[PDB]
Design a protein around this ligand. Structure first.
Ligand SMILES: [Zn+2]
Lengths: 51, 262, 51
């Protein structure tokens, strides 16, 4: 436990331990977001090579 | 004073597509129109302006006088462009997974807007309603105003008759308003990211993490919004081409039927 | 990470989004024109039916 002075008396203070569990929140979207859009496909495909 | 509201489906589509954009939060916008008389006072709503909500949280939907200035500017612009006497006449917001009726906060906000002008009316869209028992979906809408309670307490709700006017085709104003959704979402992400980058006293690995988050967020925006919107516009262009061909055929048929009689 | 802050992914993705936005703007303009043509033709057909 943590202690700190306040009114001359010492009161407890909350303590937390940082860990990987704190909102890593793995996503990875599966199932294709397929669109019958010619323009969308053309644009994504043109700018795919970029990265 | 006001007796009824007519809404052009042209703008109803923008309102509904804005309501179906997200279920996780409530969204809002403004309604532009005119005053009309019969016998009966009616409000004709022609177009709407989509807004980005800053306060967020549940049930806390309010409009800044800044957005009211923007809406009056849009009203003047549309009145001069169309030559119609268009003023900002109302507001709308979405209630996903929530009853279509207005909350006490919705009614108090409607009263706060009526203090500006008694001609102001409110709209509500009830979105994604789930019911695995019936396996049926629902989407609802309502219009309302506020009035002082039966005794000298505080404002209470009152219902306004609302009808939808068939606007056979989509107006340029409403297309230019509907294509604002992806732009406004991208601007929201960009402003959040700029507020993140404002804290110069920051780790580099944290900046890489935030960059990854930003990339995935805009990828989600494109996968869920821009892509389907563009696909719908392509499909509508195909529908319009087919409809134009059929109507041209019908015009030629009627021209041939009527022209030879003289 | 590039020079003077910024990130390469940020600008790549922003430019990709701007390209898709311009595609949507162009398609919006042309679909609006198609809607105007439909309005004209429909008014003609309905007036001829009235006659
Ligand atoms: Zn509400």
């Amino acid at each position: 436990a943590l202690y700190k002075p306040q009114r001359g008396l010492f009161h407890r203070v909350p303590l937390v331990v940082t860990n990987l569990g704190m909102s890593d929140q793995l996503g990875y979207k599966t199932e294709p977001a397929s669109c019958t859009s010619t323009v969308f496909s053309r644009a994504v495909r043109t700018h795919s090579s970029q990265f | 004073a006001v007796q009824a509201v007519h809404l052009e489906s042209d703008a109803f589509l923008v309102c509904l597509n804005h309501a179906l954009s997200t279920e996780k939060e409530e969204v809002m916008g403004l309604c532009i129109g005119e005053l009309n008389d019969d016998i009966i006072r009616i409000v004709h709503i022609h177009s709407v302006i989509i807004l980005r909500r800053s306060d967020k949280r549940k049930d806390r939907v309010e409009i800044s006088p800044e957005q009211l200035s923007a809406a009056s500017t849009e009203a003047e612009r549309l009145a001069e462009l169309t030559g119609r006497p268009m003023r900002v006449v109302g507001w709308y917001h979405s209630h996903p997974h929530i009853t279509v009726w207005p909350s006490h906060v919705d009614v108090r906000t409607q009263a706060m807007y009526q203090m500006m002008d008694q001609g102001f009316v409110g709209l509500i869209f009830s979105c994604f309603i789930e019911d695995k028992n019936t396996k049926t979906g629902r989407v609802l809408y309502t219009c309302f105003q506020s009035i002082q309670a039966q005794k000298s307490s505080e404002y209470e709700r009152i219902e306004i008759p609302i009808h939808i006017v068939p606007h056979i085709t989509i107006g340029k104003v409403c297309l230019e308003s509907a294509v604002e959704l992806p732009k406004i979402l991208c601007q929201e992400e960009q402003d959040a990211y700029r507020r993140i980058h404002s804290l110069t006293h920051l780790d580099s690995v944290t900046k890489i993490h935030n960059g990854s988050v930003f990339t995935k967020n805009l990828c989600s925006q494109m996968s869920a919004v821009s892509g389907p919107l563009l696909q719908w516009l392509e499909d509508r262009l195909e529908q319009n081409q087919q409809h134009l061909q059929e109507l041209q055929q019908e015009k030629e048929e009627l021209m041939e039927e009527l022209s030879s009689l003289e | 990470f590039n020079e003077d802050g910024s990130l390469k992914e940020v600008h790549k993705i922003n430019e990709m989004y701007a390209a898709v936005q311009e595609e949507l703007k162009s398609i919006c303009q042309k679909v609006e024109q198609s809607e105007r043509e439909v309005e004209k033709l429909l008014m003609d057909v309905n007036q001829l039916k009235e006659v």
